[PDB]
Write a protein that binds this ligand. Sequence first.
Ligand SMILES: Cc1cc(Br)c(NC2=NCCN2)c2ccccc12
Length: 264
Amino acid sequence: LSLCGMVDYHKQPWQAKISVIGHESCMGAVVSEYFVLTAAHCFSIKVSVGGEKRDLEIEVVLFHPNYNINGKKEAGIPEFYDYDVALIKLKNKLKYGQTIRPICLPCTEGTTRALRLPPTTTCQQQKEELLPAQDIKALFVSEEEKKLTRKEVYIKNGDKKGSCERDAQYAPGYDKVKDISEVVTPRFLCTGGVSPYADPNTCRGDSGGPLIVHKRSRFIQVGVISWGVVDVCVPAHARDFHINLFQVLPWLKEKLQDEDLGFL
Ligand SMILES: Cc1cc(Br)c(NC2=NCCN2)c2ccccc12
């Protein structure tokens, strides 16, 4: 079992850069020797790790079976980001080192050990530790002038969760949605806004990158960056929505079953 979430690419050795050819940009995270986790909506395909120039040979890209960006077009919702996760399977085994390391995923033995929790630890116990009912200090990784940079955000998972979710009404094409639960599903975590702190916002190029909790000197991926309310790249309603990886575990467990991650 790899030591996951342990340390520019020196400081974010899990980070992957994705280009799709006028170039669309996304990010992802190394989660095993053969897999990069990213957003489904990011999808000729160029993936790089370790700040390398080299583009890695792709075997297949696997998509969450419930993902359908067009799924609510008939209801007048232009883009529906539910289950916005994909796994890039690499042809060649990644060589872990100073520049290339896997991030921890929820409800794995890797995360149990990173959090110094006992062997009886459940998936629910990991969720209570990482995503308590409060404002949760987190980070994401962006690019500025070809250098990777950390940005600190707060996940609104307590008394501010409703306020964060309701700001979805300001996103492009969502202004006529009666029931915000139609676009903000139970798959989403919410960051951004000015309470409790003035959170920075994701850029479109940051989509697919990990939303990370930094705990006990370790980095645990809790989310995949999915969509924003405002393209800032700032109103108090500028929120960002992330796929909660605790909510896509059956799919992660099935696709990564042979990756020696020790899913619970
Ligand atoms: C950063 C960002 C801003 C805005 Br505005 C978007 N548009 C939009 N969000 C919900 C419906 N359409 C984005 C969409 C995807 C990814 C990032 C986005």
